[PDB]
Nucleic acid binder design. Structure first.
Ligand SMILES: [Mg+2]
Ligand SMILES: [Mg+2]
Ligand SMILES: [Mg+2]
Ligand SMILES: [Mg+2]
Length: 58
RNA sequence: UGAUGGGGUUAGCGCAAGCGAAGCUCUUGAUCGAAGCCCCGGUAAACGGCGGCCGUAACUAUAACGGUCCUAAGGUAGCGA
């Protein structure tokens, strides 16, 4: 068994990048569920609007 | 309560194994037989009991929601380390 830590970030990117971090996160979890890798969130970095995330650590 | 049935006895009859009248007596328990119980409803300010699992919301989180399993019904208001 392996445990790892990864971060998905918008860097210095604009709000669109801040938003795609969220969409990519949702897809990433919707794949981790089928892969059987349990996922937990350590630091969700909410973005500059609704529904945005600057970065999230899994 | 005592119907039938099966015995025990013996007057008689039998070469004689045996049959057995009536009476008496032993046993059997047909029929009758109410409550109760089973049965059918009521009743919890009667004694009492008052559920599981799983998923689910433009972001993560939670589940308003949904699926099926069971129950007699799944803890209402209110309160809650
Ligand atoms: Mg999602
Ligand atoms: Mg009632
Ligand atoms: Mg309540
Ligand atoms: Mg305390």
């Amino acid at each position: 068994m392996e445990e790892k830590i990864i971060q998905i970030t918008a860097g210095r990117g604009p709000l669109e990048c801040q938003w795609v971090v969220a969409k990519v996160l949702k897809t990433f979890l919707q794949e981790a569920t089928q892969a059987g890798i349990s996922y937990t969130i350590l630091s969700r970095e909410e973005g500059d609007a609704n529904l945005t995330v600057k970065s999230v650590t899994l």
